[PDB]
Amino acid sequence: EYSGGGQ
Amino acid sequence: QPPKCDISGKEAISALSRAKSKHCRQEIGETYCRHKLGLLMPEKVTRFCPLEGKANKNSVEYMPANPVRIAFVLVVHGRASRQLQRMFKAIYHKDHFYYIHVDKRSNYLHRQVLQVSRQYSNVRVTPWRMATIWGGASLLSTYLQSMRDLLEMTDWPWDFFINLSAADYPIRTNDQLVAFLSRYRDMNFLKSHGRDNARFIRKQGLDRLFLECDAHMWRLGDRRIPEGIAVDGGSDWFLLNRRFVEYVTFSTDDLVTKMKQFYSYTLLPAESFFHTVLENSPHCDTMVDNNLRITNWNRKLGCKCQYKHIVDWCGCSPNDFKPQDFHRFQQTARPTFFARKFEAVVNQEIIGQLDYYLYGNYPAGTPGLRSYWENVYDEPDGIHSLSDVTLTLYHSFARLGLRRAETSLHTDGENSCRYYPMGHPASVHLYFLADRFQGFLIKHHATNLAVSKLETLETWVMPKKVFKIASGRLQFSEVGTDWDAKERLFRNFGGLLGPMDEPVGMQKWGKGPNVTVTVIWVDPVNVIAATYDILIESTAEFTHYKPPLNLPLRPGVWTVKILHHWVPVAETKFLVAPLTFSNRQPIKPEEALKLHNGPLRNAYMEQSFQSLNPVLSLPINPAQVEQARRNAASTGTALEGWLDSLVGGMWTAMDICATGPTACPVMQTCSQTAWSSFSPDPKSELGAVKPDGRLR
Ligand code: NA
């Protein structure tokens, strides 16, 4: 449900 | 001004080498050295929750005796003022409160929001305005300040805090929302990721140190997750009750204090700050693991690391809903009251379906229901906020409209529809009808030459159809810039291009066995600028590619052809316009010559394709090549005629209306047309509050 997708 | 400490971290060094301003480099150095000394980030935090872990606590038809009053905090940006007004109409009730934060960079939208707040006593605008970039730490700063502001407004006795964007829409009525929240008024609604928490921390970059400066999120290094508290997160869209908001705002206990410090240097802070505080606070037993939202996640399309130039991280965003999604707003599984994202320039039909489903059809004969108008330039923001490309072309579109006025009057004597243009465009709108782009609406001033009076006019220009198929899987082909990979379209809707633009070629495909095709880019004097093959997998729906074309591009009408084993399949055309402005002033001969005579090198690409001109029947005429050199040196009226003949070959002045009194006897009044931005648009118009307390 979160918007971060790693480096 | 060397730093306070040796800066050795590769990430900090990278940020300092990329930062544009001294102030930024200073703050970067300060933050890094503070953290290096261990004085920036808290290392252990007190947990006040008495639960061993998380709570996870567990109908809308009744009429409550003591209904909740809701504080809506709208965090908005962009140009979509009419869609914002439509959504505001759906959620408005006289007993709620609306506090609107407009991104500092969105001055047009802010002026429109001010008109709303001046109309209604329960609507206010934040006097402070942040540049709330994607993932920025400033978004949490914005919520926390808005919560403090709202708690200090004693005349607004609100019970819940609900955040919404301009791309949110309700999927249940106000009555049902109030009934639900009135039964659960001591609960807080936050949605957690629910999966592995170590992966969440890593994917969110919560164990990385970030700094917001110069409208960028700089990654500065690693940091420790503080001991003693559980860290959690998920959606940054929530509903929080007043008691929890008061705790977050005014508590000085160890948890709130240290979390405010930790999350000042955190990417996407609103996706975990409120979860982490709530779960570790004395309010932990009030948490419901449901934010009452439907978020249209689609990872195959929305995770293209599209914000890589704004944040030192890769991100994802939700997709826009389409008509095929309507059935998802009727699920009874869990309680849900809002959804995102909706964009009217992408698909307005699903917005209309939803709005009439909730609140009924508008009366028969209501105009504008299938139309959408979006202002993309407004005079108060100044021609320096336009580019030389769009200023040039908007001017040309206006002159195209003025020529249409003149030729539309059939008179033996003095033509009273002849005009001389004055000044710069006053406003420009995108115009959509039934989710089809119709072109631009330009509002402009001009002197009517028969009566010698200034008039204000609006012109509708529409691009001519240029995609042509020939005797397959190809459905469409287009050239543009600013390709949106998530929504699969060009955000430069009119395909407005100048000689220094880097065009992108896109193809749209239907199902069928895999196939390979050839693309050929042809410039306006038949020079073949690029050729390449592309594989079209059986599952491919869109393909695109930005060929590396040396600049500047020769002005005029380019052609892009698609072949299948030298068998013509289709072709499209696009316009590289010559510019009449440099730095918003009329272009001078030496700059015009350097910009309009084709690429600096002899060719567009290291590899030459002169071998293909006879194969494809694209011979190069010396007389056209010569006339293009002559065109490259032109300025003033001659350059205007070159541009305007190009524009008229690719654009049509569909109509032109006057906003006020006109001496042209065939000009309609704008408000009486179906297409003008001055015509009635009731679905987005805000009037008097009705006896039931509603605007809709
Ligand atoms: Na007001």
Numbering used by the authors:
A (entry chain B): 213 to 219
B (entry chain A): 253 to 310, 317 to 729, 735 to 959
Article, verbatim:
The first enzyme in the pathway, peptide O-xylosyltransferase (XT, EC 2.4.2.26), catalyzes the transfer of xylose from uridine diphosphate (UDP)-α-D-xylose onto serine and thus determines the site(s) of GAG attachment on the core protein. XT1 and XT2 are type II transmembrane proteins consisting of a short amino-terminal region facing the cytosol, a single transmembrane helix, a stem region required for Golgi localization (Schön et al., 2006), a catalytic GT-A domain (Lairson et al., 2008, Müller et al., 2006), and a unique C-terminal domain of unknown function, termed “Xylo_C” in the Pfam database (Finn et al., 2008). XT1 has a two-lobed structure, with one lobe comprising the catalytic GT-A domain and the other comprising the Xylo_C domain. To better understand the initial step of GAG biosynthesis, we have determined crystal structures of human XT1 complexed with UDP-xylose and various PG-derived acceptor peptides.
To visualize how the different amino acid substitutions are accommodated in the peptide binding cleft, we selected five variants of the bikunin-derived peptide for structure analysis (peptides 3–7). In contrast, position −1 has a wide tolerance for uncharged amino acids, accommodating even large aromatic residues such as tryptophan. The substitution of glycine by tyrosine at position −1 (peptide 4) causes a similar widening of the peptide binding cleft. The tyrosine side chain packs against the side chain of F498, displacing it by ∼1 Å. This is accompanied by a flip of the peptide bond between positions −1 and −2 of the acceptor peptide, which, however, does not affect the conformation of the glutamic acid side chain at position −2.
